[PDB]
Amino acid sequence: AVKIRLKRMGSKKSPFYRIVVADSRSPRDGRFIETVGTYNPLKDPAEVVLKEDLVLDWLSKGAQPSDTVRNILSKEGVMKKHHEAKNVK
Amino acid sequence: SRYTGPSWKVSRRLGISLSGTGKELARRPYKPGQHGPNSRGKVSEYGMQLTEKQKLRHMYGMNERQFRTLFIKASKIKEGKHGVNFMVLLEQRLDNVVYRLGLATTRRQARQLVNHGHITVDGKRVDIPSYHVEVGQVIGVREKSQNISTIKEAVEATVGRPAFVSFDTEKLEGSFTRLPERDELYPEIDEALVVEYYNQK
Amino acid sequence: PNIESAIKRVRTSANANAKNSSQTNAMRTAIKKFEEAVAAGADNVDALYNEAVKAVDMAATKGLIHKNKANRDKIRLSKLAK
Amino acid sequence: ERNQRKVYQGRVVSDKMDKTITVVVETKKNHPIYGKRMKYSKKYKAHDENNTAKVGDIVKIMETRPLSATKRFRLLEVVEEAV
RNA sequence: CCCUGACGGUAUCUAACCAGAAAGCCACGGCUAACUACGUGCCAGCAGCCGCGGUAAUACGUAGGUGGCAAGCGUUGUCCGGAUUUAUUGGGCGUAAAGCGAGCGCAGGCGGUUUCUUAAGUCUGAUGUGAAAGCCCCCGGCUCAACCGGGGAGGGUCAUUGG
RNA sequence: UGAGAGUUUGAUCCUGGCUCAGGACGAACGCUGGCGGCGUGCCUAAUACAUGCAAGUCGAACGCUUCUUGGAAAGAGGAGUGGCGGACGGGUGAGUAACACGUGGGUAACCUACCCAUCAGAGGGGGAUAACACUUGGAAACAGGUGCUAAUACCGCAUAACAGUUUAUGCCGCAUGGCAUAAGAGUGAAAGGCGCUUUCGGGUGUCGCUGAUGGAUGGACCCGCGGUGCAUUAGCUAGUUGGUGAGGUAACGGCUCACCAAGGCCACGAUGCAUAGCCGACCUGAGAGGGUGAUCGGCCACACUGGGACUGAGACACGGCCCAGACUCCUACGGGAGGCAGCAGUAGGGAAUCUUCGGCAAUGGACGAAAGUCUGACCGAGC
């Protein structure tokens, strides 16, 4: 059950998140496999940076996003590309 | 803490004016206390390095932790010397900028003006006196309420305006043109005794 | 036990143990029943070889021996009779 | 098989056991505080299909998998025989 | 399109009023910056090491003054430095501490000149790896700073393969 | 980026010890205290633990039963059979001087639920049981007996070999051997639920079910080298070291057996005794070094003390079972119950270390088609 989920990295009331691919048994801030982009809930139009050439490779191997990761992966047009590669060939 | 004492005993103990040449050492140029006029024998070469350090620390009214951190920071430049870069970083603090510009007579008055929230850099207010003013930033006088008694009068009587300070007396904007030099800055005390004082800290 | 779900696991696993042991003993006696007839040199010797093979195979689909144990078993028996 | 195991070199030391020989591989390594180079030795056990090689031989061995409680190597070839 | 905040009427911003509520701890004979009075009389006491105290004590106890730091200041305990005082870097053995009373010798350590060869040590190139956070370098965000984020270097006595 | 000083003498130079001037800390205590921000807070007894909470969920797998609106459909409760989860997350450092850990490799000796892809199936039968109803013994915890009942619960019969194994062929590798193709022999599975079209339509969407192969992810085993004191600790081993075969395991192997032999390790420190979780890192130093392994991340070990297995993809199991032991508690004397090194909290030890708080709004986790339900992880507040 590989996942693609968020990981908290702020101070106390100014949170920040790294987008990371981890085994689902791991702790939220513990071990992971690799990091895939960044996400900032402040900064009114929220800031996303991500590689999007590893997201498409993990997605095709059975990794699965959480609910917020799917929202910010569709705002970037990554889910459409998965759609157009899988069920189109 | 900062300091509130008689501020003039301080100059009589360093042997330097500290207040824009306005004379605290006019009468009785000796030290305070009973044993003032009756001086005594020589002073070590520890007393000399301590006296130089205290001269510089009391010039700009700061505390010992902050003085030492500023000194440690100036040591990471490696472009020039280490006492020159120190005494130049010392000048770029928002209190000296208000003193040099001319909106205040003393440095204590300038400190209270920047503490009580009457000045602005680039339009935005800034309240804390240890701020680091960079080169080319017009610091202003809170165009909300610039009609105060003492600021007005202390803009008129310009005792000293330097060769690195720019200013216009209508909008009340000033800025540093570029960084100063030792010839332009107290070539009287030191920067080598102070560097040695921190070798064995 | 304290937790309600820990109390159910006790009876569930007790029942699983009961039937698991029953079926393992079934398999073991089938195999031994073949061995005691190949050590005698008796007529009706290929039929019980077949039956022992089938016994092992069925135990492997009931989650009782892994799958490699079954390959090992069928190999050993094959080298004894056929 | 594109991955490769480890081969070594040494002189045979014991040949009493049946099908097994001890080979000493020798090397020099330095001292951590002071500089100079000391010599260092460790013994290996290797497998012998027929109890061939004898003492003083200079052999090569290769890493296999557990063949007993202690032996992990096999005998590749004999390079130079003692007389 | 529509729908959800425990913190919490929290941070923050604007108006009026008032210098009014907000400074202490250690030291002052030499090391080591900062001295005069009075009390007491080898007593009462002080000390990190030198050492003070028996009638004019800058060394004890108070007062006035002065020095260092400051919402803290001193004291005890633990560790590294100063300590080249275990010395690879980086010490010594005539008299200061220190050549076994003398030989013979197994293992070990170190070895004259030179031609060809090898490549174990030695030197060097390329590839993999040495997590993240830390120290460090550049850049950026909280009114500044602590703090927070982005991109790098560094760290192996490491492995493989080619000179 | 390498600063020194006092102190042996009547005076000196050298040797030499002792002391001081710098840093830092999970610190304690004396005097004294205005605020905000970010962090930190049982180092001692791995001592004994009152009280509350820390793991459940699914009615779209299945039969029952109670209500609110004699036949009525919905909404809200109750226990039960069945699935999945409870091996994660959270705590502590007692044991351990060894493949435990770090770094570098190997497995042609290996396993892997949920997740992604591919190929092929999904046929036809049977016997029960809890609940429920009645009934016995019980101080209780709880046990039995009779009768009826359901399923994705359970069991046989069919069909499937792409799996393993053996034979021939071709190619190949670092011994054992590996890959691909052809045959031969014995054998092995499976389950429905909710919808759409519904002329009988007999079709179909979706989620589940069985067999085989890959990926991913997680685990297992073997090896080189590296990090502690004592020689006022020199001998240690008898499944011990090797071979033959047999059993056994996911798997190679003295892993365990029967037989055969007499080997193995040690001054390059075996054996024994004492102390210690290991590392990224942290403090100090000009460097080489020296001293620590608290907050945070990774690996390991333990769960009142000591043995064992069972269920399961995975445990020899942190709020599971069985036996023994010490301790505590309830009893009608026949007997029963328990384990804060989870979060708070208490008594005790100590120079010494916090509230018996709010919420799942955010991030992560379990189950469910989903709304959702659970979460002392965690996000906040208090000292």
- The b-or-e profile of B53-64 (16+ CB within 10 A means b, else e) is bebbbbbbbbee
Q: Which amino acid is at C48?
A: L
CA B57 to chain centre: 9
Instruction: Say if CB A36 and CB A64 are below 8 A apart.
Output: no
Token pair of C69, please?
């144990």
In angstroms, the CA of B34 and the C1' of F71 are apart by 118
In angstroms, the CA of A31 and the C1' of F92 are apart by 21
SS3 of A16, please? coil
User: In terms of residues, how long is chain A?
Assistant: 89
In angstroms, the CA of B10 and the C1' of E53 are apart by 38
Q: Which bases of strand E sit closer than 7 A to a protein CB? A: 23, 31-36, 64-71, 88, 109-110, 120-121, 131, 136-137, 143-144, 147-150, 160-161
Closest residue, CA to C1' of F21:
B200
CA D52 to chain centre: 15
Which residue, C20, C81, C8, is CA-closest to C45?
Answer: C81
Q: Is the shortest CB-to-strand distance from D31 to strand E under 7 Å?
A: no
As a whole number of angstroms, the distance between CA C47 and CA C59 comes to 19
- Please give the DSSP secondary-structure letter assigned to residue C80: T
Q: Which bases of strand F sit closer than 7 A to a protein CB? A: 1, 3, 21-23, 37-39, 55-57, 81-86, 88-90, 105-117, 154-156, 161, 164-165, 173-176, 185-189, 211-212, 215-218, 221-227, 241-244, 247-255, 262-266, 268, 296-299, 310-313, 317, 319-321, 338-339, 362-366, 377-381
Closest residue, CA to C1' of E70:
B1
Resolution (Å units) = 3.2
Main-chain phi, psi angles of B9, to 5 degrees: -50, -30
Residue in this structure with the two tokens 């990471």, named with its chain if needed: B76
As a whole number of angstroms, the distance between CA A67 and CA A82 comes to 17
Instruction: Say if CB D47 and CB D74 are below 8 A apart.
Output: yes
- Please give the DSSP secondary-structure letter assigned to residue B92: G
Token pair of C68, please?
């490699």
Rg of the Cα atoms in chain B: 18
As a whole number of angstroms, the distance between CA C24 and CA C4 comes to 31
**Greatest Cα pair distance in chain D:** 47
**Greatest Cα pair distance in chain C:** 60
Element (H, E) at D1: none
As a whole number of angstroms, the distance between CA A20 and CA A17 comes to 9
Which residue, B128, B123, B157, B165, is CA-closest to B140?
Answer: B123
**Looking at the DSSP assignment, which residues form a beta bridge with residue B174?**
B139, B167
Based on the number of CB atoms within 10 Å of its own CB, is D65 exposed (0-12), middle (13-18) or buried (19 or more)?
exposed
As a whole number of angstroms, the distance between CA B96 and CA B55 comes to 16
String of DSSP letters for A47-59: EEE--SSSHHHHH
As a whole number of angstroms, the distance between CA C51 and CA C65 comes to 17
Main-chain phi, psi angles of D44, to 5 degrees: -125, 150
Instruction: Say if CB A63 and CB A3 are below 8 A apart.
Output: yes
As a whole number of angstroms, the distance between CA B38 and CA B140 comes to 49
As a whole number of angstroms, the distance between CA C61 and CA C52 comes to 15
For residue B79, give Cα distances in angstroms to B75, B130, B182, C2. 10, 24, 15, 72
**Interacting residues of A42 by C-beta distance below 8 A, sequence separation 6+:** A14, A15
Instruction: Say if CB D78 and CB D30 are below 8 A apart.
Output: no
In angstroms, the CA of B128 and the C1' of F281 are apart by 36
Domain that holds residue D56: 1-83
- Please give the DSSP secondary-structure letter assigned to residue B5: S
**Interacting residues of C66 by C-beta distance below 8 A, sequence separation 6+:** C60
SS3 of A2, please? strand
Tell me the torsion sign for CA atoms D43, D46, D50, D53: negative
Instruction: Say if CB A87 and CB A59 are below 8 A apart.
Output: no
The 3 state secondary structure assigned to B150-176 is HHHHHHHCCCCCCCCEEEECCCCEEEE
Provide the domain count of chain C: 1
As a whole number of angstroms, the distance between CA A56 and CA A50 comes to 11
Provide the domain count of chain D: 1
In angstroms, the CA of D64 and the C1' of F271 are apart by 31
Instruction: Say if CB D6 and CB D26 are below 8 A apart.
Output: no
Domain that holds residue C65: 1-82
Domain map (residue ranges) of chain A: 1-89
Token pair of B55, please?
């001269």
Token pair of B116, please?
């009580």
Based on the number of CB atoms within 10 Å of its own CB, is D41 exposed (0-12), middle (13-18) or buried (19 or more)?
exposed
For residue B76, give Cα distances in angstroms to A62, B86, B141, B182, C21. 50, 10, 33, 19, 77
Query: Which technique was the structure solved with, according to the deposited record?
Result: cryo-EM
SS3 of C76, please? helix
As a whole number of angstroms, the distance between CA B194 and CA B68 comes to 11
Chain gaps in chain C, named by the residue before each (C–N > 2.5 Å) = none
Residue in this structure with the two tokens 């208000």, named with its chain if needed: B98
Instruction: Say if CB B77 and CB B85 are below 8 A apart.
Output: yes
Which residue, D24, D20, D19, is CA-closest to D8?
Answer: D24
